[PDB]
Amino acid sequence: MVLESTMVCVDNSEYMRNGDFLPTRLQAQQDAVNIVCHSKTRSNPENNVGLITLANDCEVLTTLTPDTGRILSKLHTVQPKGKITFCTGIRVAHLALKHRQGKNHKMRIIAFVGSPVEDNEKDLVKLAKRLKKEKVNVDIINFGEEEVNTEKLTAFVNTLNGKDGTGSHLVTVPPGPSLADALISSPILAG
Amino acid sequence: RTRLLDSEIKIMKSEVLRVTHELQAMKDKIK
Amino acid sequence: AVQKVVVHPLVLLSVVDHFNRIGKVGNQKRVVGVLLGSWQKKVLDVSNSFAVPFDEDDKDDSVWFLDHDYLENMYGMFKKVNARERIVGWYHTGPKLHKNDIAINELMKRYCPNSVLVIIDVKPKDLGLPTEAYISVEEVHDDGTPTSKTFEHVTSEI
Amino acid sequence: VPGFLQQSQNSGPGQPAVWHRLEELYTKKLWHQLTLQVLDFVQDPCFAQGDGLIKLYENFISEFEHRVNPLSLVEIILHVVRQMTDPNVALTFLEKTREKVKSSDEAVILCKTAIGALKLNIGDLQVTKETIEDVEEMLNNLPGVTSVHSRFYDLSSKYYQTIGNHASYYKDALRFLGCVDIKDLPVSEQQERAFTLGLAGLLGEGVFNFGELLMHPVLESLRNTDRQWLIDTLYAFNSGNVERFQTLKTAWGQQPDLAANEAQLLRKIQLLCLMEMTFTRPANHRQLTFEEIAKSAKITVNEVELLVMKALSVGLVKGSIDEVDKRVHMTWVQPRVLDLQQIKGMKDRLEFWCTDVKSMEMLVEHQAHDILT
């Protein structure tokens, strides 16, 4: 198993709500946290996968812990509504992921974004070159829908890394008729 | 058809909260 | 409605040796920590507290770190030694404030009827008073905006 | 149901620019920019033909969508009421949509301020106080919406038009002053609200410090194109008496609701003339004769006692008035509201206090020097 601390961010924002694929888009993100958390549970009992949010705050509710079933209870009433922000969850995931254990793992982030997120091109290039300077490989995931011609997350894939990069990838999702296990099975390959 | 889902999440919260009623009961009862 | 508290300098001396921690763990300048205690009256006593491993970004100053490994199980220890001495608030050094402080108060107002922020002093050269309290206030304005929450100068003492 | 708007697609010239798109929104099954399409139908000048049809599809949104906050549903019934012009079933339909469309939001405040917004057809004071009261019963949690505080002003101000607290329009208009801070609508309507703000706060006396927030920018920006003596007769109660043509210009020009409590306004130039005359000369002779009182405050000798005994009921100044010499004595007062020229010019008292109590402090400690011991 490859050594990283993958940081999952709940997409508890207002564009993860309707009845297009399932009658509940929370099942998509919830089962995504299920498959990555059981993936890190079966992967290594030395990781630390807790929770971080993007809506209006970065609330580390539980301990950044190798346990997950409490966070799985926190997946219930996740409140999928709020001000989505791409800038804060990665930064607090970085300084949160500098508060880690006996350094056995690198820093990975998965960022569930179901919105045309409010981020400048200057903000993604500054954050993405800070992540160049700070040795982080990020798996970038669209849920719900992002607007067509995705600018934020795709150019965040662009300027992310190098010198053992190869983490920066994006699966954009359309708001069509499908099911949510294909909406996580499509980014389960290349996050 | 969503009242069974909210009452169902409240029922898993009733199993967790009953596990904390047996942790507030049993786990405190240990000490 | 808080005039004063009783301050034991014991855990203030724990702010002294955590002030010895921050000089040797690295970049963290300010000593930030969490204040234990019990509301008895408008007058209060603080008998214990604890100092948090905390980091604070200078860019977007509202980045808190109050670990719940560090919170919950240490509250089980601090509960295990005494059921009385639970939380009452929290502290940090510097004289004025911290762009994060208000949010850091609201993380523990779920734990306390009035989580107080008592901004503390590691290097006393002051002209006024020592460490001083700030209670939960909603003074807003005569305006009718969303509710103000910045915690106002509610007198305390040693 | 798709054909329900395939038949009602074209709704005017240039109008189907959002309808050739709207026939693709529900095929995309989004509901957020469709909420913004309800808001766009508020935005586009529709005369309420499409909403009054599509409200059955809004009941369908209550059937199978069942996630969107009914903000835009309350919007769309208060824009279907253009087609209706009858609120009597829009209220039952409104609380119906309140109880049948679920949200984790504060949904009762927007619905009861929606009932208060449509309460104007009820013949008021019979149903106002109950649910209008219930909004501030439920405003205590979080006024983060604060346009429910604007609607709450509007029922609070039609509730001011339920007569009986004639300067609750002052503080209530200050709630309107920060229900939204930016005036977010043109100058003329709200500067007529600055006209009738000055009037309805003026002639109504529940407030006494009436010349207080005339400095405030969102109202004086309105007053820059108001009539040029309403501002000045508001200065007649901001300065307080000494604008005789302005404390009389309320009698020259402003006729409605005037003579009912104009003698009380002229009582307020006297009460306000007190904090004038004890502020303006700070020094002694605070046992003032009634001469400036009987002269400048347009009162006679027999009434100066009432001029203070009513002020005894006021309680800002509590003078110990001589009655062997008829001398109106000055005690502690509520002095002024703002003298920024003396917020600068307070140095001859503040720094005076600083270096004189500090310097004479060092004259004591310089005398009490070599007992340092």
Cβ neighbours of B30 (radius 10 Å): 6
DSSP of C82-107: -SS--EEEEEE-SSS--TTHHHHHHT
Q: How far is CA C65 from CA A59, A96, B25, D96, D217, in A?
A: 10, 8, 31, 45, 41
Say yes or no for a CB contact (<8 Å) between A20 and D67.
no
How distant is the Cα of B30 from the closest Cα of chain A, in angstroms? 23
Neighbouring chains of D at 3+ CB pairs under 8 Å are A, C
- Which residues in chain D have Cβ-Cβ distances shorter than 8 Å to A81? 104
Length, in residues, of chain B: 31
- Documented resolution in Å: 4.7
* d(C-alpha D371, C-alpha D199), whole Å: 68
Q: Which residue from B minimizes the CA distance to A27? A: B5
- Which residues in chain C have Cβ-Cβ distances shorter than 8 Å to A60? 65-68
Residue D254 lies in domain: 1-330
Residue D337 lies in a domain: no
Residue matched to tokens 């310097």: D359
Strand order across the A106-113 sheet: A52-53, A4-10, A106-113, A137-142, A170-171
**Cβ atoms D317, D274 nearer than 8 A:** yes
Say yes or no for a CB contact (<8 Å) between B16 and A73.
yes
Q: Which residue from C minimizes the CA distance to A95? A: C55
* d(C-alpha D187, C-alpha D191), whole Å: 6
Question: Which of D24, D25, D26, D32 best probes binding to A when mutated, by most A CB atoms within 10 angstroms?
Answer: D32
- Tokens representing D131 are 């649910």
Q: Which residue from A minimizes the CA distance to D26? A: A20
Own/partner contacts of C110-116, CB < 8 Å, gap of 24 or more, are C111/C86, C111/C87, C112/C39, C112/C87, C112/C88, C113/C39, C114/C2, C114/C39, C114/C88, C114/C89, C115/C87, C115/C88, C115/C89, C115/C90, C116/C2, C116/C35, C116/C88, C116/C89, C116/C90, C116/C154
Neighbouring chains of C at 3+ CB pairs under 8 Å are A, D
Residue B13 contacts A, CB cutoff 8 Å: yes
How distant is the Cα of B31 from the closest Cα of chain A, in angstroms? 24
Helix orientation angle between D148-161 and D168-179, rounded to the nearest 10 degrees: 160
Question: What is the rounded (10 degree) CA torsion for C15, C19, C22, C23?
Answer: -170
Q: Which residue from B minimizes the CA distance to A74? A: B13
Question: At D285, which amino acid appears?
Answer: H
Question: At D55, which amino acid appears?
Answer: K
Solved with: cryo-EM
**Cβ atoms C30, C94 nearer than 8 A:** yes
* Helix, strand or coil, per DSSP, at residue D49: coil
Residue A191 lies in a domain: no
| From C63, C67, C103, residue closest to A63, measured CB to CB | C67
Question: At C97, which amino acid appears?
Answer: L
* d(C-alpha C29, C-alpha C54), whole Å: 10
How distant is the Cα of A24 from the closest Cα of chain D, in angstroms? 9
Residue D342 lies in a domain: no
Residue A153 lies in domain: 3-186
Total domains, chain A: 1
How distant is the Cα of D271 from the closest Cα of chain C, in angstroms? 24
Residue D159 φ then ψ, to 5°: -70, -20
- Which residues in chain B have Cβ-Cβ distances shorter than 8 Å to A24? 5
* d(C-alpha C108, C-alpha C88), whole Å: 9
Beta bridge partner(s), residue C89: C35, C116
Q: Which of C83, C112, C74 is nearest to B31 (CA)?
A: C83
Residue D369 lies in a domain: no
Half-sphere exposure of D268 (CA within 13 A, CB side): 21
* d(C-alpha A190, C-alpha D113), whole Å: 49
Q: Which residue from D minimizes the CA distance to C143? A: D178
Q: How wide is the angle at C-alpha C72 spanned by C-alphas C66 and C77, nearest 5°?
A: 120
| From D142, D174, D179, residue closest to C147, measured CB to CB | D142
* Beta strands at D327-329 and D287-289: parallel, antiparallel or unpaired: antiparallel
| From D142, D144, D178, residue closest to C144, measured CB to CB | D178
- Which residues in chain B have Cβ-Cβ distances shorter than 8 Å to A76? 9, 12-13
Q: Which residue from D minimizes the CA distance to A77? A: D104
Say yes or no for a CB contact (<8 Å) between C63 and A91.
yes
Q: Which of D344, D345, D169 is nearest to D257 (CA)?
A: D169
Q: Which of D223, D159, D216 is nearest to D192 (CA)?
A: D223
Residue D318 lies in a domain: yes
* d(C-alpha A19, C-alpha D60), whole Å: 13
Residue C87 φ then ψ, to 5°: -65, 155
Contacts of D213 (CB under 8 A, 6+ apart): D174, D219
Total domains, chain D: 1
Residue D152 lies in a domain: yes
> What is the maximal distance between C-alpha atoms in chain B?
45
DSSP of A18-44: SSSSSS-THHHHHHHHHHHHHHHHHH-
* Helix, strand or coil, per DSSP, at residue D270: helix
What b-and-e string marks burial along D169-189, b requiring 16 or more CB atoms within 10 Å of the CB? bbbbbbbbbbbbeebeeeeee
Residue C51 φ then ψ, to 5°: -110, 130
Q: How wide is the angle at C-alpha A147 spanned by C-alphas A145 and A152, nearest 5°?
A: 105
- Which residues in chain B have Cβ-Cβ distances shorter than 8 Å to A73? 12-13, 16
Say yes or no for a CB contact (<8 Å) between A98 and C55.
yes
Neighbouring chains of A at 3+ CB pairs under 8 Å are B, C, D
Tabulate helix, strand, coil % of chain D (nearest 5). Answer: 60, 0, 40
* Helix, strand or coil, per DSSP, at residue A141: strand
| From A19, A81, A177, residue closest to D64, measured CB to CB | A19
Q: Which residue from A minimizes the CA distance to C70? A: A63
- Which residues in chain D have Cβ-Cβ distances shorter than 8 Å to C145? 143, 146, 178, 181
Half-sphere exposure of D235 (CA within 13 A, CB side): 13
* d(C-alpha D179, C-alpha C140), whole Å: 12
Element (H, E) at B23: helix B21-24
**A-B C-beta contacts closer than 8 Å:** 8
Say yes or no for a CB contact (<8 Å) between A96 and C65.
yes
Those of residues 28-87 in D touching chain A at CB distance below 8 A are 28-32, 64-68
**A-C C-beta contacts closer than 8 Å:** 31
DSSP state of D121: G
Say yes or no for a CB contact (<8 Å) between D29 and A175.
yes
**Cβ atoms D226, D194 nearer than 8 A:** yes
* d(C-alpha D308, C-alpha D315), whole Å: 9
Those of residues 129-158 in A touching chain D at CB distance below 8 A are 145
> What is the maximal distance between C-alpha atoms in chain D?
103
Say yes or no for a CB contact (<8 Å) between D178 and C147.
no
* Helix, strand or coil, per DSSP, at residue C25: helix
Say yes or no for a CB contact (<8 Å) between A19 and D30.
no
- Which residues in chain C have Cβ-Cβ distances shorter than 8 Å to D178? 141-145
